[PDB]
Scaffold this active site. Structure first.
Site, short mmCIF file in Angstrom:
data_model
loop_
_atom_site.label_atom_id
_atom_site.label_comp_id
_atom_site.label_asym_id
_atom_site.label_seq_id
_atom_site.Cartn_x
_atom_site.Cartn_y
_atom_site.Cartn_z
N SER A 1 2.16 -9.88 -0.56
CA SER A 1 1.82 -8.46 -0.25
C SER A 1 2.10 -7.20 1.43
CB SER A 1 0.01 -8.43 -0.96
OG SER A 1 -0.62 -8.54 0.24
N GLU B 1 -9.85 5.19 3.10
CA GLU B 1 -10.12 4.69 4.14
C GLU B 1 -9.42 3.49 4.44
OE1 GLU B 1 -9.98 4.68 0.66
OE2 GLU B 1 -9.32 2.82 0.21
N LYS C 1 0.44 -0.96 -0.13
CA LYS C 1 -0.18 -0.38 0.15
C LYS C 1 0.82 0.75 -0.20
CE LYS C 1 -3.96 -1.54 -0.36
NZ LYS C 1 -5.27 -1.40 -0.88
C1 LIG Z 1 -7.65 -2.81 1.73
C2 LIG Z 1 -6.59 -2.50 2.75
N1 LIG Z 1 -5.95 -3.59 2.76
C3 LIG Z 1 -5.29 -4.93 1.80
C4 LIG Z 1 -4.81 -5.41 0.96
C5 LIG Z 1 -4.81 -6.70 0.62
C6 LIG Z 1 -6.09 -6.21 -0.75
O1 LIG Z 1 -6.16 -4.54 -1.17
P1 LIG Z 1 -5.84 -4.51 -2.71
O2 LIG Z 1 -6.38 -5.81 -3.64
O3 LIG Z 1 -5.77 -3.78 -3.66
O4 LIG Z 1 -3.90 -5.79 -3.18
C7 LIG Z 1 -3.64 -7.28 0.13
N2 LIG Z 1 -2.69 -7.22 0.86
C8 LIG Z 1 -2.60 -6.38 1.94
C9 LIG Z 1 -1.63 -6.30 2.86
C10 LIG Z 1 -3.69 -5.96 1.92
O5 LIG Z 1 -3.47 -4.75 3.58
C11 LIG Z 1 -5.91 -1.30 3.54
O6 LIG Z 1 -5.68 -1.70 3.96
O7 LIG Z 1 -6.85 -0.56 3.87
#
Ligand SMILES: C=C(/N=C/c1c(COP(=O)(O)O)cnc(C)c1O)C(=O)O
Ligand SMILES: O=P(O)(O)OCCNS(=O)(=O)c1ccc(OC(F)(F)F)cc1
Ligand SMILES: O=P(O)(O)OCCNS(=O)(=O)c1ccc(OC(F)(F)F)cc1
Ligand SMILES: C=C(/N=C/c1c(COP(=O)(O)O)cnc(C)c1O)C(=O)O
Ligand SMILES: [Cl-]
Ligand SMILES: [Cl-]
Ligand SMILES: [Cs+]
Ligand SMILES: [Cs+]
Ligand SMILES: [Cs+]
Ligand SMILES: [Cs+]
Lengths: 395, 268, 395, 268
Positions: free
Chosen positions: C376, C108, C86
Site C-alpha cells: 500500500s 484527517e 491514498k
Molecule cells: C490513515 C492513514 N494511512 C493509512 C494507510 C493504510 C491503512 O489505511 P486503509 O485501511 O484505509 O488502507 C495502509 N497503508 C498505508 C501506506 C497507509 O498510509 C493516513 O495516511 O492518514
C-alpha cells in the site's frame, strides 16, 4: 585498444592507473556483448517495467504556465522506484556485474539516490554493496543514508577534502584499484573513464525515448527544447540522447550556480572551468591556476561536483547543446513553486532544471514554446534542508 | 643526460640493486624537506622519487595523502617544487631524480612546457600515475624531446602486448608494481614476479624497480634476488616523517637508520 | 432517503448529527452523477495516468519465497505519486469537491499519506487544504508533516485523547459540521458515514482491477489469495472489490495486533471488538464494557484506529473474507526482510500484510499457493522510527 | 409521565418561555455536580439537559469536551449517572429532565434496556446527538415504549420533509439549532428562524427550544420574542464551573446569578 570510441571530440579517454585498464576493457567487452544479447535485454526490460515501474509519466503542468505561451511537461523520473533516474542504469550495470562474475559492488553517492539505487539493486540481485559518501552529504541528505543501511548496504563516510561527491568518487576509485578482481565499480553518472560515459548514456536513454513517444502522442510534434540539470551528466544525456539527431529540438543543460558564478562557489565547469584530466577523463573542470582541482559548491549534493561528463563537453563545443546555470536561490524558488502549484516535491537537483524553464517562460511570456523538463528525482531527501533554510530566512 | 643508465651500469659492476626512497616535495615544509632529501642521499639512496603535491592523488593511500596535505599546509606549489629541484640537482649532480606526477599537473598549461621545465632543473624521469600506455603518446613524446625518461608501469597481471609496449615506450627504469591497490606500507606486495622480470629483460626494457608496499629490508632483498634492479619505498619513509614532526633531529636520525638498512638489503 | 444502500448487512449507515445529513446527501448525488459522466471519468483517468503514474507495477518477489511452493507478487501502490494508495481516491474526491462548488478541503491523517495526498491534490486543483493529525503521529510520521506544509497545507496537531488517528478524525468531523457550506471533508478511508465507504471503494477499485489483469497476463490464472492490511479499510477494499465475485480467490485482511491481542494494545476490532456506533457508522469497534470508545495501538500510525469500515465487517460476517492480525514485531521483521531481500522499503502498514503472507508461506512451505500482497505504501515516512527501534534493540 | 406537557402549559398560562441549562453529570465530581444541579433549579431553571460523559463527544466544542474529561477524571460512569438521576428526581418530582446521549452509550448493551433504565429513574426525554431522523426508528420506538420523549433536531436549513418528520416523530420539545457547528458559548447563534418556528407550529410539533451558542440574556429574550418556547444554554454554564474549580462556594454564587438573569430574560 578498445571496441568503442573512448572520446567525444577532445573529451573523454581512459585516464586511470595502468592497473585498472584490464577491468575497463573487460567491462567494455561485457557491455558490447550484453547490448547484442536478447536474453540480457529482456531481463533488463523486465526489471525496468515490473520492478522499477517504467514507463514513467509525462505530466503537463498547467498552473505554473498560466497566462504565458509556454506549454511545460515534466518527465516523471521522480516516480521511479528509489525516487530518481539513477535506478535505471544501476539495474543494467548490476546485470553486467553478474555477467562478469562479480559478487560485490562499490558505488559513490552525493545526493544518496545513486547509493539507494545501488543498494536496492544489490539487495534484489544478490550483491554485497559498499557505498562511499562525503560526510557533508551524509548530513544534508540523511534520509538516504537511512534507506541505504536498511537495505543492507555498507555506507562509508568520507571526511577528506570537501567531504562531498568528488571526495566520495576518489575513495571509490582508490578502493576499486585494489578490489577489481571481485568488485564492480558502479559509477553513477555519465563521467569517469571510458566505457562509463557510454554505458551510462545507453542505460539511461529510455528517458528521452519515452519522452519522444509521449510528446508525439500528446502534442503531435517534438518539443522546442528539453531541459535537464547537469551534475556528472547522466539524467541530461539520458533525456538528450534520442533527440540528438532531431536538429530542431533544443538541448539545454543546467549547471549549479551555487552562491553565484562570480563568488567562485558553484559547480559549473562546462561554462566556467577549463579542460583538465581528473577522475579518469579529459573534461572541463574547476581548477586553480596551477592545476589543482577546486572544490565545487551547490545547495544540491547531486550537482556538487567540479567536473562534467565528456559527451556534454563535446555537445557544447559543437553547439548542439546549450548550457546555463541556476543559483541556489533560483533552485529554491522553483522547488517551492512546484510544491505549491503542482503538488510535486522535486529533488533540489531537478529544481535547477525547472528554475531555468520558469525563467525561459517568465523572460519571454508571449513566446510560443513547448518545453520538457526532466524531473530527475523527488525531494523527500531535501525536505529537512529546505525547511531549515526557509526557517532561517524568516518564512 | 644518462643518469639512470650510468647508475644501473655502476650497480651492475658492483653486483648491487638500487634502493630508491619516495617523499613528497615540501613535506612538512620546504626547508625541512630539503634536509630530509639530503639525509636520504647521505644514508645511501641510489636515486629519488619525488612527489609534487596534488589535490586529489588517486593512486595514493592515506600516508601519502597526508604528506600532500602537509605540503599544502606549508603553502607548497609546483613552482616551489621546481625551485627545490634546482637546488637538489645543484648539490647532487649524478643522482637520478624522478618525479611522481598526476596528469593534470603536467597537462595544465601545456605538456611540452612541463617537460621543458623538468629538463631545465635537471630531472631525469617523470612517472604520470593516471596516464596508462594507451593515453601516453603526447606525454612520452614530450618527455623524449626534452631528454626526460617517461616511466611506465608493469602491473602483476600484465599481458604480453603490455609488456612489449612498456619495454618500447619507457626509458630510465620500468616500474614493477608489487600488487593492485594504492600506495601503503601496511599492505605488503607479493614477491617480484619472475616471469615479468624475465619477459622485460627479453624485450630489452629499462631495468625494473619494484614498488608498492616495500617497507622492510627483507622485501628489498627479495626484489633483487628475483632479478629486479632495485626497489622503491614511499609510505614507510613518509611514516617516519609523520611520526617525528615535533622532533626534526630525531626524524633525520630515524630516516638515516631506515634508509641505511634498506640500502644494505639491496646488496643481497 | 438515499440513492444507494448505506448498509452492508447490519453495518454502515449515517450516524451523524442531523446538521450534516444534507451534505452527505449532496455528496452521494454528486458521486452518482459523476459515475455516469464521461467527462468526469476521463478527467479522473487522465490524472491517475499522467499525474499519479497508474497503472502501478506488479512485482514478482523471487528471493523471499526461495525454497517454498509460494509464488508472491506485490502490487506496487508504493510507486504511486505521494507514496501510497491514498492518492487514487483523493484525486476522485477532489474532483467531486470541485463539482459541488467547494473551494476548501478538510482531511484527517495518521500515517500522513492521506494528508500528503490531500495536500498534493489541493495544490494541483486549486483548493485550500487543512489537515488534522494526532500530535503523536506528527512526531512518528514527521517526514509527512514537512511534505504537507511545503505543499501549502495547514497541518493542525491534535493533542486530545490518544493524539492519534481517531482524535484527528473527531476534530475533522467537528470542523466539517460548522464548515460544510464551503468545505468538503475528504475522508481518507473506507469508513465513516455513507456515502464514504462506497465512494472510497469505487475510487480505489482500480487496484484490484489492475492486479487481476496483471496476474492473468503473468500467470494465466487468478491468485489463490490477495492480502492487504486493514486500518479503516481503503487499500484492502480497493484490492478486494474486483475479486469479490471470483469465489475461488481468498480475501485476507490483516489488522494490527500491536503488542499482542492479549495485551489489549492493538487495533483489531473486526476480530476482537464488538459492534458499536461511532464516527458516523455502525461497525465493530474497540470499546469498554460501558460503551466508551477505547484507544487503539499500533506501531504503524495508519493502522492505529479502534474501528474498521463496514464493508469489511460485512464480508467477514458472511465468510467471504478472512481477517487475521500481525503484531508490531512481526511487521518489523517483514519490513527488514523486504528491504534486505527485495530492495523495497515498505510502509509499516503494508509490512503487516507482507508479514502475514510470509507466515502463510513459512507455516506450510510445501503448499502450492499464488499470493498477491497489496504493498500500500513506501516506508520513507517510517525510516526514523524503525532505525530508532533496531538501535534500542541492540542491532 | 407528562412533565414537558405540564411545564409548557404552565409557562403558556404565565406567558413565559423556558430557560433550560445543560451540565455534564458528575462534573467536576458527583457530590459537587448534585449541588450544582440543585443550584440551577433553585435559581429558576424550568427544565434540565444533562450530559452522560462519553469518550468521543462529536457534537461538542472544547468547553463541554473538558466537562466530560473532568467527569472521567472523577471516575464517573453511566451507572453512576443513573444513580445521580434517581437522586435528582427524588428531590424534584415535576422538573423535566432530558439526557444528552451519544448513540453508542444507548446502543451498547441494548437500546430497549437503555430506555427502560431511563424510565425507572424518572427521565423525561433523551436526545441522541449522532442519530439523525433517518436512523432513528429503533431509538424512538424504544423511547415511546418506555414513556420517554425522543428529541429531534431542526437545523437552520431544514427542508419541509424534515420539518414534517421532526414534528411527527419527536415529543416533549423540538430542538431548534441556532447554527451549524458544535457546542460553544463563543460562537453565537443566529436569531431563531421565524419560518421554522412557524412551520413547526403548523405541523403540531412539540414546542421549540433554541440551543447552541446561547450565552446571554438578550439571546434568551430574542428566542422567546421570535416565538420559541424557550432556550438552552450549556457552554456558558459549564464555563462558570471551569473557572471556579478551586472556589466551589463562588462557583454556586456565580451559577445562581447567571441562571437567574437568563430566566428573567425568558419572561420578555
Ligand atoms: C490513515 C492513514 N494511512 C493509512 C494507510 C493504510 C491503512 O489505511 P486503509 O485501511 O484505509 O488502507 C495502509 N497503508 C498505508 C501506506 C497507509 O498510509 C493516513 O495516511 O492518514
Ligand atoms: O611504498 P609505497 O606503498 O608508499 O609505494 C611508493 C610508491 N611511490 S611512487 O612514487 O613510486 C608511485 C608510483 C606509481 C604510482 O601509481 C601508479 F602506479 F599508478 F602509477 C604511485 C606512486
Ligand atoms: O450552549 P452551547 O453552545 O454549549 O450548546 C448547548 C447544547 N447542549 S445540548 O445538550 O442541548 C446538545 C444538543 C444537541 C447536540 O448535538 C446535536 F445537535 F447534534 F444533537 C449537542 C448538545
Ligand atoms: C550524484 C547523485 N545524484 C545526482 C542527481 C542528479 C545529478 O546527476 P546526473 O547529472 O548524473 O543526472 C540529478 N538528479 C538527481 C535526483 C540526482 O540524485 C547521487 O545520488 O549520488
Ligand atoms: Cl629534535
Ligand atoms: Cl469557596
Ligand atoms: Cs500556458
Ligand atoms: Cs557539475
Ligand atoms: Cs518459490
Ligand atoms: Cs484498525
Amino acid at each position: 585498444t578498445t571496441l568503442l570510441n573512448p572520446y567525444f571530440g577532445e573529451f573523454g579517454g581512459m585516464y586511470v592507473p595502468q592497473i585498472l585498464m584490464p577491468a575497463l576493457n573487460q567491462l567494455e567487452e561485457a557491455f558490447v556483448s550484453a547490448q547484442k544479447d536478447p536474453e540480457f535485454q529482456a531481463q533488463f526490460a523486465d526489471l525496468l517495467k515490473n520492478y522499477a515501474g517504467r514507463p514513467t509519466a509525462l505530466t503537463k503542468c498547467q498552473n505554473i504556465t498560466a497566462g504565458t505561451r509556454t506549454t511545460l511537461y515534466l518527465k516523471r523520473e521522480d516516480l521511479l522506484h528509489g525516487g530518481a533516474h539513477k535506478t535505471n542504469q544501476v539495474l543494467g550495470q548490476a546485470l553486467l556485474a553478474k555477467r562478469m562474475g562479480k559478487s560485490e559492488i562499490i558505488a559513490e553517492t552525493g545526493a544518496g539516490q545513486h547509493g539507494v539505487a545501488s543498494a536496492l539493486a544489490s539487495a534484489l540481485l544478490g550483491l554485497k554493496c559498499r557505498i562511499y559518501m562525503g560526510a557533508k552529504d551524509v548530513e544534508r541528505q540523511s534520509p538516504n543514508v537511512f534507506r541505504m543501511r536498511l537495505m543492507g548496504a555498507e555506507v562509508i563516510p568520507v571526511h577528506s577534502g570537501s567531504a562531498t561527491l568528488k571526495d566520495a568518487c576518489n575513495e571509490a576509485l582508490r578502493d576499486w584499484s585494489g578490489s577489481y578482481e571481485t568488485a564492480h565499480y558502479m559509477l553513477g553518472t555519465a563521467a569517469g573513464p571510458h566505457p562509463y560515459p557510454t554505458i551510462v548514456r545507453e542505460f539511461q536513454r529510455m528517458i528521452g525515448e519515452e519522452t519522444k513517444a509521449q510528446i508525439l502522442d500528446k502534442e503531435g510534434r517534438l518539443p522546442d527544447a528539453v531541459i535537464a540539470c547537469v551534475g556528472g551528466g547522466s539524467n541530461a544525456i539520458g533525456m538528450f540522447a534520442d533527440f540528438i539527431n532531431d536538429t530542431s529540438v533544443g538541448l539545454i543543460g543546467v549547471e549549479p550556480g551555487g552562491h553565484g558564478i562570480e563568488t567562485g562557489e558553484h559547480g559549473a565547469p562546462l561554462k566556467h572551468g577549463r579542460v583538465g584530466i581528473y577522475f579518469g577523463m579529459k573534461a572541463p573542470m574547476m581548477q586553480t591556476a596551477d592545476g589543482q582541482i577546486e572544490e565545487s559548491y551547490s545547495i544540491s549534493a547531486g550537482l556538487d561536483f567540479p567536473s562534467v561528463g565528456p559527451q556534454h563537453a563535446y555537445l557544447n563545443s559543437i553547439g548542439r547543446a546549450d548550457y546555463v546555470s541556476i543559483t541556489d536561490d533560483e533552485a529554491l524558488e522553483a522547488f517551492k513553486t512546484l510544491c505549491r502549484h503542482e503538488g510535486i516535491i522535486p529533488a533540489l537537483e531537478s529544481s535547477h532544471a525547472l528554475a531555468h524553464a520558469l525563467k525561459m517562460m517568465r523572460e519571454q511570456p508571449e513566446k510560443e514554446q513547448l518545453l520538457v523538463v526532466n524531473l530527475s528525482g523527488r525531494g523527500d531527501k531535501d525536505i529537512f534542508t529546505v525547511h531549515d533554510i526557509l526557517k532561517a530566512r524568516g518564512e | 643526460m644518462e643518469r639512470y643508465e650510468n647508475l644501473f651500469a655502476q650497480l651492475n659492476d658492483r653486483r648491487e640493486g638500487a634502493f630508491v626512497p619516495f617523499v613528497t616535495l615540501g613535506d612538512p615544509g620546504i626547508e625541512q624537506s630539503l634536509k630530509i632529501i639530503d639525509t636520504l642521499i647521505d644514508a645511501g639512496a641510489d636515486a629519488l622519487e619525488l612527489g609534487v603535491p596534488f589535490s586529489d592523488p588517486l593512486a595514493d593511500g592515506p600516508t601519502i595523502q597526508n604528506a600532500n596535505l602537509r605540503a599544502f599546509a606549508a603553502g607548497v606549489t609546483p613552482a616551489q617544487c621546481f625551485e627545490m629541484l634546482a637546488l637538489i640537482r645543484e648539490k647532487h649532480p649524478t643522482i637520478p631524480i624522478g618525479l611522481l606526477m598526476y596528469a593534470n599537473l603536467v597537462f595544465n598549461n601545456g605538456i611540452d612546457a612541463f617537460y621543458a621545465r623538468c629538463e631545465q632543473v635537471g630531472v631525469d624521469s617523470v612517472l604520470v600515475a593516471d596516464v596508462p600506455v594507451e593515453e601516453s603518446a603526447p606525454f612520452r613524446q614530450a618527455a623524449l624531446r626534452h631528454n626526460i625518461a617517461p616511466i611506465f608501469i608493469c602491473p602483476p597481471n600484465a599481458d604480453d602486448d603490455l609488456l612489449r609496449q612498456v619495454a618500447s615506450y619507457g626509458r630510465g627504469y620500468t616500474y614493477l608494481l608489487s600488487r593492485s591497490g594504492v600506495t601503503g606500507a601496511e599492505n605488503r606486495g607479493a614477491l617480484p614476479l619472475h616471469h615479468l622480470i624475465e619477459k622485460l629483460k627479453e624485450y630489452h626494457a629499462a631495468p625494473a624497480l619494484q614498488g608498492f608496499g616495500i617497507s622492510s629490508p627483507e622485501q628489498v632483498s627479495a626484489a633483487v634476488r628475483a632479478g629486479a634492479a632495485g626497489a622503491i619505498s614511499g609510505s614507510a619513509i613518509v611514516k617516519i616523517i609523520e611520526k617525528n614532526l615535533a622532533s626534526p633531529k630525531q626524524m633525520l636520525a630515524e630516516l638515516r637508520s631506515f634508509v641505511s638498512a634498506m640500502k644494505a638489503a639491496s646488496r643481497a
